[PDB]
A paper describes a structure:
Owing to multiple mutations to the spike protein, including in the receptor-binding domain (RBD) and N-terminal domain, Omicron BA.1 infection can result in substantial NAb evasion. The Omicron variants that have emerged more recently contain similar RBD sequences to BA.2, with the addition of L452 and F486 substitutions—L452Q in BA.2.12.1, L452M in BA.2.13 and L452R/F486V in BA.4 and BA.5—and exhibit a transmission advantage over BA. We expressed and purified the prefusion-stabilized trimeric ectodomains of BA.1, BA.2, BA.3, BA.2.12.1, BA.2.13 and BA.4/BA.5 spike (S-trimer). We determined the cryo-electron microscopy (cryo-EM) structures of these S-trimers at overall resolutions of 3.1–3.5 Å.
The BA.4/BA.5 spike that we used in our experiments also contains the N658S mutation, which was present in early BA.4/BA.5 sequences but later disappeared owing to the lower transmissibility of this variant, and may correlate with the more closed RBD configurations of the BA.4/BA. By contrast, BA.1, BA.3 and BA.4/BA.5 spike possess relatively tight inter-subunit organization with more buried areas between S2 subunits. Notably, the F486V mutation in BA.4/BA.5 spike decreases hACE2 binding activity owing to reduced hydrophobic interaction. We also noted potential reductions in hydrophilic interactions owing to R493Q reversion. Despite this discrepancy, we conclude that BA.2 subvariants and BA.4/BA.5 are able to maintain high binding affinities for hACE2. However, we found that BA.2 subvariants BA.2.13 and BA.2.12.1 showed increased immune-evasion capability over BA.2—with BA.2.12.1 exhibiting greater evasion than BA.2.13—and BA.4/BA.5 exhibiting even greater evasion. Nevertheless, BA.1-stimulated group B and C NAbs were significantly evaded by BA.4 owing to F486V and L452R RBD mutations, concordant with results from DMS, which explains the strong humoral immune-evasion ability of BA.4/BA. However, group D1 antibodies showed reduced efficacy against L452 substitutions, with L452M (BA.2.13) causing mild escape, L452Q causing moderate escape (BA.2.12.1) and L452R (BA.4/BA.5) causing severe escape. All seven tested Omicron subvariants displayed substantial evasion against neutralization by class 1 and class 2 RBD antibodies: the variants evaded neutralization by REGN-1093323 (casirivimab), LY-CoV01624 (etesevimab), LY-CoV55525 (bamlanivimab), COV2-21965 (tixagevimab) and BRII-19626 (amubarvimab), whereas only BA.4/BA.5 evaded DXP-60415,27, which showed reduced but still competitive efficacy against BA.1 and BA.2 subvariants.
Author numbering:
A (entry chain C): 29 to 296
B (entry chain B): 297 to 675, 687 to 735
C (entry chain C): 736 to 826, 847 to 1076
D (entry chain B): 980 to 1125
E (entry chain A): 736 to 784
F (entry chain A): 980 to 1028
The structure:
Amino acid sequence: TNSFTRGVYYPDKVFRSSVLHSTQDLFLPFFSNVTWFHAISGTNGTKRFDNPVLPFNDGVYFASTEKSNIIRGWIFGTTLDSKTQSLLIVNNATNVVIKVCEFQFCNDPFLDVYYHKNNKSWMESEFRVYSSANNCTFEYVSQPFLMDLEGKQGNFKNLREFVFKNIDGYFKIYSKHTPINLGRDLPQGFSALEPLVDLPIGINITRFQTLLALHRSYLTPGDSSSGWTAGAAAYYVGYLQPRTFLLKYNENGTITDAVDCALDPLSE
Amino acid sequence: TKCTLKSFTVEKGIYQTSNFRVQPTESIVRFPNITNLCPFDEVFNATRFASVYAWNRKRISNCVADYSVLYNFAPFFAFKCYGVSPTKLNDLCFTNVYADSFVIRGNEVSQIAPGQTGNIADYNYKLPDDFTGCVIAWNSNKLDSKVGGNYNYRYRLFRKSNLKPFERDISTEIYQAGNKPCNGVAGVNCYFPLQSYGFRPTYGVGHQPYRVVVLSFELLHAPATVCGPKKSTNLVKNKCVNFNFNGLTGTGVLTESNKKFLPFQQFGRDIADTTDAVRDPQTLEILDITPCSFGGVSVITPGTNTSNQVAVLYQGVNCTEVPVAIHADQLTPTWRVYSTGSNVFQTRAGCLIGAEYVNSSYECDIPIGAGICASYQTQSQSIIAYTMSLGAENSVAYSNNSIAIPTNFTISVTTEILPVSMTKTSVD
Amino acid sequence: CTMYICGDSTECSNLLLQYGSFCTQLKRALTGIAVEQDKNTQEVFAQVKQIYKTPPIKYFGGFNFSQILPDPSKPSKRSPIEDLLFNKVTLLICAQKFNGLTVLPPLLTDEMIAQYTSALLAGTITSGWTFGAGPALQIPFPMQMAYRFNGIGVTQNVLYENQKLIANQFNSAIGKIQDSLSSTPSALGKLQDVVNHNAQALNTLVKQLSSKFGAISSVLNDILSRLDPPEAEVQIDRLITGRLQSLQTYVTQQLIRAAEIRASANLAATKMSECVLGQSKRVDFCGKGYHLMSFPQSAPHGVVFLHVTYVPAQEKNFTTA
Amino acid sequence: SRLDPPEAEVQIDRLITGRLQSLQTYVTQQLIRAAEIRASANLAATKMSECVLGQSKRVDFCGKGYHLMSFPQSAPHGVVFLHVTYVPAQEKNFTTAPAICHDGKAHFPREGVFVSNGTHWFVTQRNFYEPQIITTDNTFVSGNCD
Amino acid sequence: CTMYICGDSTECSNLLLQYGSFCTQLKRALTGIAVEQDKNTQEVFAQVK
Amino acid sequence: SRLDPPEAEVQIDRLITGRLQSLQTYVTQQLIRAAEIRASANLAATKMS
Ligand SMILES: *[C@@H]1O[C@H](CO)[C@@H](O[C@@H]2O[C@H](CO)[C@@H](O)[C@H](O)[C@H]2NC(C)=O)[C@H](O)[C@H]1NC(C)=O
Ligand SMILES: *[C@@H]1O[C@H](CO)[C@@H](O[C@@H]2O[C@H](CO)[C@@H](O)[C@H](O)[C@H]2NC(C)=O)[C@H](O)[C@H]1NC(C)=O
Ligand SMILES: *[C@@H]1O[C@H](CO)[C@@H](O[C@@H]2O[C@H](CO)[C@@H](O)[C@H](O)[C@H]2NC(C)=O)[C@H](O)[C@H]1NC(C)=O
Ligand SMILES: *[C@@H]1O[C@H](CO)[C@@H](O[C@@H]2O[C@H](CO)[C@@H](O)[C@H](O)[C@H]2NC(C)=O)[C@H](O)[C@H]1NC(C)=O
Ligand SMILES: *[C@@H]1O[C@H](CO)[C@@H](O[C@@H]2O[C@H](CO)[C@@H](O)[C@H](O)[C@H]2NC(C)=O)[C@H](O)[C@H]1NC(C)=O
Ligand SMILES: *[C@@H]1O[C@H](CO)[C@@H](O)[C@H](O)[C@H]1NC(C)=O
Ligand SMILES: *[C@@H]1O[C@H](CO)[C@@H](O)[C@H](O)[C@H]1NC(C)=O
Ligand SMILES: *[C@@H]1O[C@H](CO)[C@@H](O)[C@H](O)[C@H]1NC(C)=O
Ligand SMILES: *[C@@H]1O[C@H](CO)[C@@H](O)[C@H](O)[C@H]1NC(C)=O
Ligand SMILES: *[C@@H]1O[C@H](CO)[C@@H](O)[C@H](O)[C@H]1NC(C)=O
Ligand SMILES: *[C@@H]1O[C@H](CO)[C@@H](O)[C@H](O)[C@H]1NC(C)=O
Ligand SMILES: *[C@@H]1O[C@H](CO)[C@@H](O)[C@H](O)[C@H]1NC(C)=O
Ligand SMILES: *[C@@H]1O[C@H](CO)[C@@H](O)[C@H](O)[C@H]1NC(C)=O
Ligand SMILES: *[C@@H]1O[C@H](CO)[C@@H](O)[C@H](O)[C@H]1NC(C)=O
Ligand SMILES: *[C@@H]1O[C@H](CO)[C@@H](O)[C@H](O)[C@H]1NC(C)=O
Ligand SMILES: *[C@@H]1O[C@H](CO)[C@@H](O)[C@H](O)[C@H]1NC(C)=O
């Protein structure tokens, strides 16, 4: 799929209305394609895990669609072990656990009996990824950023969009939830992302992985051919680039539009 | 007028001299209720800080860092802050402070500047060029020392490459000094990168350990955290004050803001460089800071050759409100004897003070603006502000079959003045 | 300068007088431009000592002048053509006043300008060119045109033999002018540019305060509260030079811009005194073709002319000797 | 004399920039001032070559009214013109008509306008009332008078 | 400016943008002169349709 | 390549001001020169007409 217009946020924490201010910050380029990494997560027999490692090329635009709580968290850090601090995030049931403490190996939910989702709709026996370490950086538990709107008779798709970026060590999370019905991946339109979380932790972040709990399989197909295809997707990952984006706000203050300055000569 | 024009005899006409500016009534300082003392004062009470290979970052949380309390404990040695002034560290608000525990050789305590690139910089810690922060230190030789030599001050002597600023890791490797695989332990052509000072308490200050607290901070968009016990004050919504909102020094008329900040948005800006809107640290109120009402002043005079009465023009002000209702010492220009003046005549370029508008039009001499002129004559000589007369009204009886043919003439000789050449100049 | 250069700070203002009279010159230079604009309108319009009124009955020999004569019905006593001109020239504003930037209103109001324009129209229509050489003299319009045809090379018998046809041509031609400005979006390009350049020049001047000019920050109050006094000025004076030079550049740019306007302002006065106040024998000075007579029309920050020209057509070639 | 050479330049160069840029402004201000004079200088030459060296048909170019002559006069840093102009006065209004019909044919004035004092019709020049008896050499015929 | 003032150096160019719009004005001012030269030839010569 | 970064701008900004002011002087000098040409260009247009 192609990131047509999504991947735009509020660059600075300053209000302005009816202004055409320019910005030098990091942004996801317009009209750039992003990877799917569609994972079946069958939880059957021996091993069903299809969440590979991502290079984290100077920040990640992470989009995802689910029903209630398919996505769980993210993992950062290079060594992926207790040797270096891992920026592990857990989207709790009614909380968030954003911890940096080292872990030997993140745990996983039990690969249960072959009778996986016959009638076992209960919710327990989670991953419990937090491996105890004597050396820990303090966590930043706060309000959960996963708010879900109940849509009925279909025609609802609460897409969750996030941007994770590292600049001068400071690590920032921008987030948005958009409850619009999409007929295709990365639907048209415009939605600016608000700044949510800051992090004053400085360490190398050259690797990336996604946490997803799908012990109860809910409409997850698979494929075995790389290329530019179409179909249902669990999430999308794009890499941010140094750009020179220009922004247009509203009278109310919402960022109504943005234009690239290195994509099209007309845009220039 | 005769001061700005620099003479004693001013000619008839209008002259721009200065501006009319009201002055703030009171001073307002507004800070977040929280003022919990800051726990970084406990760092001063501590004895052992760190060994410089995996330096930590003691982030000071949301509290109040009465810096004078730290200055009341013991005298400081370096106190060299190449950033914010380390004297008025009280009435400005810090988003976050990142002082780190540190100690180094007393020959290198004076090398805390980010220019001494070497063992201290390329291997221990490097400070970026575009950096703001302070450096403080005090005596730590007698408190912690060893007769044989302080081996606890071991540090990273050598590493793989240049140590980038704001990077924290342990160089657990052995330097390749020759053709030797350094994955295995060796002593020849493969040396372990490490150095220990071995300090002793019976030598000069050039070889005595000094504990150093590198104060690192930055002024951010984030809400203010650590800016002292200073008294919060009241709030006004109609009067110009000298506000100090979260360390944002400024002045102007503060009023309620109808602009819709997003639930997170904090500072408001116009299409300009000054902060137009602001969010109150307490009661989450949104204010609409605007500069105090002001305008330029020009004086209409008929010349000292003729008289001495003058009429002042406050440009671009609805003067029924601002200059008429001036309290004692409301303006620094003063000359407040004309608070009400002789008569007031509102004009699109601001009202006139000291002149009476007459209903009879004349050809005018001193222009003011918006079709209004001024002159000095009788109503017993005063300054009037009549609307300028466009000329004597006339009408000619156009008709179907009427011609007007002159029967006489007048050979009139007029004059015309034209500059041709200005005086030549040459400089060296 | 006391407002634009320094944020009404007594610390910065002391450094401003430290630079001498770089600001007395700028205030004086801009004052010369301000009095120049009020002077420029004087030569273009204030060419008549008296103000004339058209008679109540307005049968101008079949010529229709309703598009250019003022209509008393409107509260703004302006012609329908002038009304269209005023609507098509679009003149933020409040943010400039808070940084020491001011706009002074012109000495002559737009309503007073339309009175000179009406006076000039009344003199040309009823009195002809005589009201620019002395006392206005009564002369019927059908015979005014006959002595304007005599001024281009056609005998006066041509007009009377085609008076009704010529009036229909003039009435239809003047009615196309109103639609011509509406159709073309760039019709008033020269006038719209004058107000555009001024707005952009002030907008650039306000936006120049963001240039930190080698200092810590663009906000002057930031340094005074954050940076100690005895060393802050080396950043203030670094900031004041860029701020002052940016202000000086704007003043210089206005001087060339005002000089170009003075070239156009004198040209309009030159055209007013010959195309309108008489009949000009110069070719292509008062419109394409043999010029007959002209009409002044008030416009925002300028003037609009309606040159009535004589253009031959429907020709046949003969044998001469 | 007061401050040492190795560090005086950082105060001299600070002083030389303001001193030089002050001189730069004067040089620039002269260029616009000289350009304005050039517009006036060429206008004076244009007026000299038309108002003085001849008679100008341009209205309100060589003085108010019909221009006759001009006299240049030397002046400090400029020139002074004495425009001699013709201005009508003592006007009278008569009854007029565009043409005269005598034998069914229209008669038009070769020069001047037809003027009647109340009883007899006269044709006279435009800028001076000099009535004349309407004869066939003072008019021409173009078609019938209908 | 990016070429005359700075020798295509990313260190100098960062300082140049830090001065604001002294360089958008010069580019615009010279652009206005360039249009004038093409216009000046129009009135002198392009008088016949 | 010779002088260190954290005070190279101390000499770069001193050099950029004189370099920029010279460029600004050329831009201004062209404006008067173009204005004089425009006066001559209109004169040629008048003579042509
Ligand atoms: C800014 O947001 C406000 C609401 O927060 C909008 O105001 C509403 O606009 C709709 C548009 O039709 C009206 O039906 C409502 O009655 C308005 N409500 C209120 C309380 O004003 C406003 O339109 C928005 N501004 C925009 C879109 O420019
Ligand atoms: C002939 O001229 C005389 C004066 O020269 C006219 O008399 C006055 O003209 C002025 C012109 O503005 C009018 O305001 C007065 O009302 C006139 N007074 C009278 C008593 O008429 C006279 O009307 C003119 N007559 C014709 C036929 O042109
Ligand atoms: C001047 O001539 C016109 C027509 O040649 C005379 O008739 C007037 O014509 C206009 C326009 O058609 C009408 O609005 C008027 O009502 C007409 N007047 C009359 C009395 O019918 C006009 O009367 C002549 N002027 C004078 C003073 O007689
Ligand atoms: C035309 O004007 C001239 C002067 O403007 C008149 O000459 C004057 O005539 C009176 C009558 O005796 C003398 O008292 C004056 O001394 C004369 N003036 C001069 C300057 O000599 C002349 O009478 C006028 N003629 C008409 C017909 O109006
Ligand atoms: C002069 O032209 C105007 C055109 O503006 C004429 O006004 C028109 O009059 C007719 C008949 O009353 C209307 O149908 C049109 O709508 C009018 N046009 C408008 C209002 O724009 C005016 O009548 C003409 N003068 C004379 C004497 O006929
Ligand atoms: C994205 O596009 C690049 C170049 O257009 C291509 O090499 C890459 O395979 C694409 N990846 C996906 C997942 O579409
Ligand atoms: C387990 O489920 C996955 C998808 O949910 C499916 O691909 C797999 O075939 C299943 N296991 C078996 C043994 O069928
Ligand atoms: C998640 O929530 C459960 C109960 O809702 C709580 O016991 C647990 O501590 C939470 N985890 C984190 C990391 O906050
Ligand atoms: C388990 O599956 C059976 C299938 O017959 C169903 O009847 C029963 O309701 C299921 N249990 C639950 C708790 O839903
Ligand atoms: C954890 O703490 C102790 C401190 O010596 C030790 O086991 C080890 O060095 C630490 N782990 C790190 C720094 O990764
Ligand atoms: C981060 O990685 C870079 C290169 O991969 C290295 O030069 C640097 O020392 C690393 N920093 C830390 C703190 O490990
Ligand atoms: C701070 O004090 C003000 C005083 O009115 C109060 O309104 C506000 O709620 C307080 N805020 C907190 C966080 O206690
Ligand atoms: C007043 O002006 C006149 C001429 O304008 C002059 O002769 C006289 O000396 C002046 N008086 C004073 C006191 O300057
Ligand atoms: C000026 O002030 C008066 C109060 O006397 C008020 O009625 C009027 O609306 C004000 N006008 C403007 C333009 O501010
Ligand atoms: C002006 O108004 C006053 C009072 O309304 C009146 O007495 C006077 O006659 C008027 N003058 C003129 C010239 O209208
Ligand atoms: C008009 O002039 C003639 C010239 O002979 C004269 O006889 C006649 O009396 C004049 N008319 C009047 C009304 O004086």
